[PDB]
């Protein structure tokens, strides 16, 4: 399924998507992406909209 990441960082903002078999898989992809791009924030996941957020 399609999962979305809302980036709400101090310097990186926007949205990305990934196709993943489940939410755990999407979470790993998105957390690695956020880490690689220097985002260190609080996370949420909404299973109804398949949307993760990370906020600094």
From Swiss-Prot:
Subcellular location: Secreted, Cell wall
Sequence repeats: 3-56
Name of the protein in its database record: Immunoglobulin G-binding protein G
Lineage: Bacteria, Bacillati, Bacillota, Bacilli, Lactobacillales
Full protein segment contained here: 304 to 357 of 593
């Amino acid at each position: 399924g399609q999962y979305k990441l809302m980036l709400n960082g101090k310097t990186l903002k926007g949205e990305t998507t990934t196709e993943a078999v489940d939410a755990a898989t999407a979470e790993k992809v998105f957390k690695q992406y956020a880490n690689d791009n220097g985002v260190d924030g609080e996370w949420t996941y909404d299973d109804a909209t398949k949307t993760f957020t990370v906020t600094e």
